[PDB]
Symmetry: D2
């Protein structure tokens, strides 16, 4: 067996936009993402799937069922977010000089929170309180995340921006968003601190800036291709993180961290180890050096330094890189860039999404963070698109083993949260990518236990990979799978 | 949910030759099958795999572990056989006219059993008693089968016969075997009646005669190609069944049945329904009409009539047939005649063994037997070769559902026994075909729970296909599998 | 045997941007498409492959070898374009009210032509003359096409437009481009008419407008997503075609047609026949009714323009695969998993093999397309493109024979089809996809620029030299066996 | 370019039983193989496919058409056999001590030949003359082979032997067959020497003995499993070859060789080179050392037989794929998943594509086999068979060019190789597998008996007419791309 520390918790992560809608009464039309996936032109271009989130798994109405299943599964931790748009669906009075590059301080006090109070949707707040109380009643430790991608439409009209029009609400391109995000975060902590165990400001800010402004074929808002604007967005979201951290801490003593999108950077040949380090700097260290050490672009900002208590590690697969004349490049045919339901250039099985099986990468990522910063971590996402459940039992057990391995090496990792408890709306890809331990019938909103859920219940209830399921710490056999 | 009657039992079947050996001390070199798979010429011809049963899962030594796992899995029934060769490894004194075609009576009484007693291996008998006592102590209902293919070498030297030499011990071609089988069966019931709940005389006599003397590419002993001798073997094994039934009943009041190899015969087109009936007559009814009604080839034998209390239905897949000028033919590309790890001509997934997914066939077979004979049934075998466990969760739930369906239609089916609890020696194919709910590491003899075992535990402990696993009553998705 | 009329020609089609560059001194850096595929942001987004056209098959320098192989293969017809950008690399003097929606007339006279002649690149002109004279010396009948997608940069900066900046050169969004295209076409006809047998104004305007402004994941310039701007570009390209036809006719008596991208629209179920007609209207008839019958929609009204009516002598049918459509509450939709929307090197939802590009094998659609055009307009046709992405040459022998058979079938039904031009003689630069998609009868080694005959080229030679699908290769009129192929 | 010597010939090989029947009046029901494939028990066991040779490509009636296509394809050599059973359908008079292990001499003189002539079927003889004269009229050099597996039923009843009854005609288990084969070969030479350029005594004796008595799942007659009887049959077939060589030489001055089934033995790891040598000894050298050097094992002793020594003028190299071997405690073993032991239409354990028959693409092995024979014996060779089961023709263009290149390489290294004969010109009856395995350059429609040129036939014509792999097809000297193929 592989036994975990008595305090280690197994659980799951999910997001508001992806899971909440589906039950009549749950509809939240007020985000950039809602508008984006309903857009006629985006649909015709195939940038979005045509599936709509209001036809979703219905966590808003059915949360008690989700929680019942999580409890039966032996889970002891959950990470979810509140949707900003639900709490503040209408524009807030403008506060503050918008032309200033840096946002070093956002003053938040009791009076200001009471004023914000008057703009908040009370029905939304009460409902979230009901969801989280039910969550806590199952013995679930609660990590509350403030943001998992959708912005209020009054902060970002993504179609205007796609069209090249920067005169409207411009999302992460505007310091007004940084300012309001800080206040929103403080406001939520102020309202929910009694229920929350730990906080995250944000989920994967690198993906928001990266796919929003560079990887435009991904169909992420606002899909405006610009290196310069991707930089500006990332700069703003970093400041937003720091200002949200200060805002939360003005109102709570609880740990505040951040959740980030990771890949394990692997050398194509033994001559590519420098390329790996350059990739890690460019995709990981530059960001965390900003919010932990205050290092940014080359100065030190005291308002950025030390704004992090813990690191949420999301991990799915690797990225293979090679050294280049001018620098380095990532290679197609490995990691996230494989054919769906096939095999990578290394002969490793790929998921319904075309992502390569590579659990060793998780050990790489956890130990590298630990060695650099010595901040404790949760694995906040790890899972696989696999409606049939062919690969998931292996994917699950193998990655859990790599976590045990990281802890064995000295890394302080305090939980593993699978993505996800149930199938949900996979962004521009729609419902066809199914990540759940539980299968969703979208017609009836019924949840079914895929065999991996029975496997995870084994792990969670025992706090270990048991002797009986240890064989799943291996690669899915490729011979019976599609090539 | 699909709930079964309170008296219905879920369990498993296994065979002595396939599971017993593997632990030092368990070796049984005294069968036709042992000699057959060790034969240098058979190995060079590829008729046998080259794997040897003494390197097996080791039920002989490890039975307590098998039973522990079965109990944890919620199983309540088991069907196993004693190996004839273990109990009588040495030739018995010749009794009886060998030239007579019919064996209508075998006189067995107390004195004769006491005499046989003096030739029996006491160590083997005591060991089986230990295995079965442990089995009963887990709350397992016990179906004891007398025969599952290997014969004592002193009754059958299969290499001599393969070579065309009929002067030696000739197995089912000799009425001496019919005579000794009747006595052996009576002897075992006499020794074990206190432990046994129900009896089977034989496992799949049609396969012994069919592959032994016609389907010679299967590498089954003695591999002598002869329509005439296949008929003679089948004639003898039928009489053997009847004489074993009388012999058991001379010593016990408990139910005595037989286990038979079934296929669901399906019409290629709607013009082939006559072909189906001809196939069913030729492969099923002729045999059961002999041992139930005494009808044989065209007379009635009173010594054959009514020799059956129950029917063991083994079922894996269908056979597609078409009408022919001269009669009917079976079609390649369906049922058992598909490519391994692929798809049939109907687009249905095939197993590691090349067998087509067709659970509806089981409903067909159970209801047809019920309607003809009105004898109660157990599903004595059903399973799939699937080391990876990709298809098994679906195979398991789908077939269990078809049993529920048969019962719903009025058929008296009293249990479902999966083939098998753990991986074992798949005859001429060796160890590579893995049918277990539990995976065997043959190096250490350790057993692991494949996810289907967790699924089966759900079914068995609840006496139902539960709401949560009901989605597995479907065909494995073929898109992610090999074509 | 399937024998063709004695006058029928077998040949090939090729485009300037895709095949010219690759030999020393052949580079043409002056187009929208050149800038588009070199753009750092386009490359990082994966909109373009990273492959560059200047590393291509080298027709500019190696044309004699291309033509040697075409002659050896028994080909008797070719359709190529001149690249506008090579002839006019620098801007011409502003002539004309850019605010006017319609361009009903473009006056071109001999004096105007002689002025234009002062701005034309003479080396480029002379080189094209050398290429075309060699072509004609092989006994190849010559269809000269004026345009096959790239525009001079001075007429379109696609990066600016991608960024949503409409103050610069805007390509088909500007009537200036319409005006200049007319003059350009008249000019090329004026200079080359002695070498040309028939003219086409343009290749697949519907793709330029459709992928440029709607199908933006395709990585075609300017990649600005706008239904309204797609409509505007299509409106301009239609009037450009008409003005180019009048311009060519002012200087030549020869036939002037257009080449258009076709799909065979097929009903998912027997209840989807209406859906097909609606798709045919929306993707085909609306365009050809504008340039043949003068019928068109301007803003929100349905009018006849006398300046558009009758501007077409022949139709170039480009055809690769079908589109499967189904009827919807609000209209019709096309279905993934058939036609061009399949997995690469696999099988469609109908069990038909797909190409290296994920396009479904459906030769029957060529019969559908040819006979439908014939019955509507009764204008003669050439099949101006038909071919398959297939480096290994597994499917091409079947693809070629089967589609050629379908043209024999169309003629048999009464359709006036005068030739079949395979895409392409050799591998070339497949737009945003780069070099990996190989459509050639001849394989190109891009390192040495050497050409190799795939077995389909030997098959094609059998067809062309005999003017028939011979008895000996007739079995290739069938679907490539799927069992040995990837699924 | 890979150019061959001016004297080198490209051609094909074909067998009587596999190609002759299919036309009215061509049936030969009088062989062991005919009875074997019609046998009800063999059919029900799946030992044989159920396909029947009398439904075959019809060379007996259509030979002129076969030869027309071979001439069109530029072929200059052919190797065929006469079927023994057609010439002597009824038993001959018993001559000779059947209990003697060795047959050191078979006296044949002109008087004996004239007596044999009284029993020969004259219609069959005249028909073969007609076939062979037509063959020679195409400029085809003629290798006549005496035997390619089927024996007259009066010499072998394979069902009896399958049943373990050795009292009837026992085929290669009886010296009577050795004795009669010698007379038969002398006889055919006597009758046909004016038409023949070179002779082979037999095709692949090692397969006859090996699959007949050991590899019994292959469904080859008599399918009686016995190491000892396999040894006995191989011993007899060896002496039959020697006696047939002396018999032919008594009547002809022409070269007399033998055709043998080859595999290239390859080491799994660098520690398996000894294993290869042992496999080469056991599967190849032991046989050829008997008939060239007279070295052999009788019962349990190693002797030189003067009556076996030097009975060979040339070696026919048949080659399809490799065998991968590894060293074992007790010796060596060959490995599944490489060579002929792969899944059909898939990839081997080495990632190389497999044929319709599950045979791995390994042209390098032909170089290995040719040079090894050359270095051991210094006898000239023809590649007498090489080809692939491939109905679709996906892999054959690569298979053909690559193996032909390997023969060019062998000659380059000094090996005297005088021709390459593809198996086969057209599809035919593949033994126990039936018609489904298609090896032809030409595809056969078995309903009409029409022949079609697969693209590989056009490729082969390029090679044969030029006497070279030309520059234009040189890219086919490569492995078929696996990505678009089934795995
Ligand atoms: O793609 C799976 C999963 N992965 C994610 N990042 O990699 C997102 O956080 C989550 O919203 C998404 O659903
Ligand atoms: O082939 C699976 C299984 N199936 C069986 N019959 O179909 C045999 O009873 C059993 O011994 C064998 O292992
Ligand atoms: O996609 C192949 C081919 N097909 C075309 N239309 O479909 C284009 O005219 C041509 O430039 C392109 O290369
Ligand atoms: O298996 C193809 C071919 N190969 C052969 N040896 O390998 C035989 O001589 C020939 O008869 C057979 O048809």
């Amino acid at each position: 067996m592989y036994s975990f520390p008595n305090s280690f918790r197994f659980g799951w992560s999910q997001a508001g936009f992806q899971s909440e809608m589906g039950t009549p009464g749950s509809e939240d039309p007020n985000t950039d993402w809602y508008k984006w996936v309903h857009d006629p032109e985006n649909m015709a271009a195939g940038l979005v799937s045509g599936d709509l989130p209001e036809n979703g798994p219905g966590y808003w109405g059915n949360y008690k069922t989700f929680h019942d299943n999580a409890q039966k599964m032996g889970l002891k931790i959950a990470r979810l977010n509140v949707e900003w748009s639900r709490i503040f669906p209408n524009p807030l009075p403008r506060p503050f000089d918008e032309s200033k590059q840096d946002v070093t301080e956002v003053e938040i006090n009791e009076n200001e929170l009471k004023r914000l109070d008057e703009y908040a949707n009370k029905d939304a707040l009460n409902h979230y309180r009901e969801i989280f109380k039910d969550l806590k009643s199952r013995g679930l430790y609660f990590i509350l995340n403030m943001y998992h991608w959708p912005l209020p439409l009054w902060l970002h009209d993504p179609i205007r921006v796609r069209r090249g029009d920067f005169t409207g609400p411009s999302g992460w391109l505007s310091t007004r968003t940084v300012y309001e995000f800080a206040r929103f975060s403080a406001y939520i902590a102020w309202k929910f601190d009694d229920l929350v165990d730990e906080y995250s400001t944000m989920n994967e800010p690198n993906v928001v800036g990266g796919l929003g402004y560079v990887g435009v074929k991904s169909g992420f808002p606002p899909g405006y291709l610009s290196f310069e604007l991707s930089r500006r967005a990332m700069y703003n979201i970093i400041q937003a993180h720091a200002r949200a951290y200060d805002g939360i801490k003005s109102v709570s003593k609880k740990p505040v961290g951040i959740i980030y999108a990771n890949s394990s950077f692997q050398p194509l040949t033994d001559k590519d180890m420098e390329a790996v380090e350059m990739a890690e700097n460019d995709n990981r260290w530059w960001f965390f050096d900003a919010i932990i050490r205050g290092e940014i672009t080359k100065i030190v900002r005291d308002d950025l330094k030390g704004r992090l208590d813990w690191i949420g590690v999301n991990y799915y697969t690797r990225t293979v890189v090679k050294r280049t004349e001018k620098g380095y490049v990532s290679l197609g045919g490995y990691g996230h860039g494989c054919e769906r339901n096939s095999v990578s250039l290394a002969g490793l099985p790929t998921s319904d999404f075309g992502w390569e099986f590579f659990p060793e990468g998780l050990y790489d990522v956890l130990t590298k963070y630990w060695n650099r910063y010595h901040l404790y971590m949760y694995v906040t996402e790890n899972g696989i698109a696999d409606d049939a459940d062919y690969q998931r039992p292996y994917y699950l057990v193998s990655h859990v083993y790599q976590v045990h391995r990281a802890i064995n090496s000295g890394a302080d990792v305090r939980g593993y949260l699978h993505w996800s408890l149930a199938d949900n709306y996979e962004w521009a890809s729609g419902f066809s990518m199914r990540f759940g331990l539980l299968k969703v019938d979208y017609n009836t909103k019924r949840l079914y236990w895929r065999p991996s859920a029975l496997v995870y219940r084994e792990i969670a209830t025992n706090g270990a990979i048991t002797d009986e399921i240890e064989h799943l710490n291996s690669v899915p056999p490729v011979k019976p799978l599609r090539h």
